Every structure is written in C-alpha cells, then in structure tokens.
Design a protein around this ligand. Structure first.
Ligand SMILES: Nc1ncnc2c1ncn2[C@@H]1O[C@H](CO)[C@@H](O)[C@H]1O
Ligand SMILES: Nc1ncnc2c1ncn2[C@@H]1O[C@H](CO)[C@@H](O)[C@H]1O
Lengths: 114, 114
C-alpha cells in the first residue's frame, strides 16, 4: 500500500514528514524544498504513478486532493491566495512517480508558471 | 448558466474560443495568451468562482477537469508531459473568477512554477 517511491515510504510512515492533514484517501505535508513561504503537497494514499495514468474512476479522488489543498491553505492562513500545480512527466518536471499536488502561497506567484 | 465572466460568455458561445473538447460538464479551449507551445484551459460549465469556493460535492467535477486535461494533452501530442495549474486569488495570479485549469506543455517547464 502506497507504492515503491519516496511518497510510498511517507504514506507507510517509514519516514516522517511534516503532516498537516490525513484522512482515509490522502495525506498533506510540507515540501522539503519549499519554493514559497508556504509550499505543501497533497498525495493520494492510492498509488497512481502520474496524472496521465489516472482513470475515470479516480476523478473524485483527484478532486479531493484540491479540496484538501484548499482546506490546508486556509488552515495555514493563505488569505491572499495560492497556486496549485501537478507535474506530469519529463516536461512537467515530475521526479517522483506518485501523483502529487503542490500548493504554493505566501508570496505573489509569477507568470509563466515555469 | 456559465456565470458573468469572460468564461461565461465562452460557455454560452456568445464568443467563440478555440474549443478542443466539450462534454456536459466542461469545456477545453486554447489559451489566447499561450505561455508554452501548447497551452489550453479546462473549465467547468458550472460557475464556481475560485477553487477556494468549491464545495465537497464538487470533487468529482474538479477531478473531471484533470482527466479531460490528460485526454486533451494526449490528443495534442504531449508525449513528454505537461504541467497543470490552478490559480487562486491575488497571490495565485487569478484574473478571471471562474475556475480554470491551465495545461501547459511542448517545452520543458521550469521550477519554481512562478
Ligand atoms: N521526504 C520528502 N518530504 C517532503 N517533500 C519531499 C520529500 N522528497 C521529495 N520531496 C518533494 O517532492 C516534490 C516532488 O515533486 C519536490 O517538490 C520535493 O522537494
Ligand atoms: N477569450 C479568451 N479565450 C481564451 N483564453 C482567454 C480569454 N480571455 C482570457 N483568457 C486566458 O484566460 C486565462 C485566465 O487565467 C489567461 O491565461 C488568459 O490569457
């Protein structure tokens, strides 16, 4: 359960993370290389390698990650907003093959988004 | 139906857009100010002003936007990957208050994501 990546280890608690939310579907934790004053990840407990591998039946789970991200952003005081990011594959900058939603805020986010 | 923003006008077809996908839940169309060789938006037909205003019952719809984004990215040949972005509020760089998912690819996306 949780798969064979860094994030599988986090889900199994084999290594800790700075956990800010947990429910039966997902986990949220602070990013170890933050790119903004607040930068956290929301990950499903189900191992989905990448967004391009998600199936139709995963829609509710994927949307759950954004609703959790909204809740966590509010808990962390992101009153002025935030940016949500999912990276796919090489061009997207994905390095860990377990779906993860980035939530960044606490500063003005620029454009383009990379 | 569709709300009182630019994107409401697009949903009602009062102004055209470069539509690449339509179903009963959402619309996808090319962005008018592209930041990558492929840059399109996926929007719900339901007016949700911003991700921070989405409700729990919207989870399936939000996840549908990413699954549509995955499908469109494949139709557009984004074999090397892509980045998905949702902007919230001022700090997120949101300018149109109707939820929209950006999908960018056809080049290496950089880090940080703005
Ligand atoms: N042990 C870890 N805890 C928290 N974030 C991590 C860990 N390993 C990698 N990351 C974050 O995972 C992301 C992968 O997209 C990165 O932003 C990276 O910094
Ligand atoms: N008529 C339009 N058709 C397509 N994209 C648009 C239109 N108006 C604004 N946008 C795009 O909407 C986004 C709002 O985040 C921008 O990336 C902007 O370029």
């Amino acid at each position: 359960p949780g798969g064979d990546t860094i994030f599988g280890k986090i889900i199994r608690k084999e290594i800790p993370a700075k956990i800010i939310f947990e429910d039966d579907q997902c986990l949220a934790f602070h990013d170890i290389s933050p790119q903004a004053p607040t930068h956290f990840l929301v990950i499903p407990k189900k191992h989905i390698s990448q967004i391009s591998a998600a199936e139709d039946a995963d829609e509710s789970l994927l949307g759950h990650l954004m609703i959790v991200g909204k809740k966590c952003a509010a808990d962390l005081g992101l009153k002025k907003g935030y940016r949500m990011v999912v990276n796919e594959g090489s061009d997207g900058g994905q390095s860990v093959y377990h779906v993860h939603l980035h939530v960044l805020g606490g500063r003005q986010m620029n454009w383009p988004p990379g």
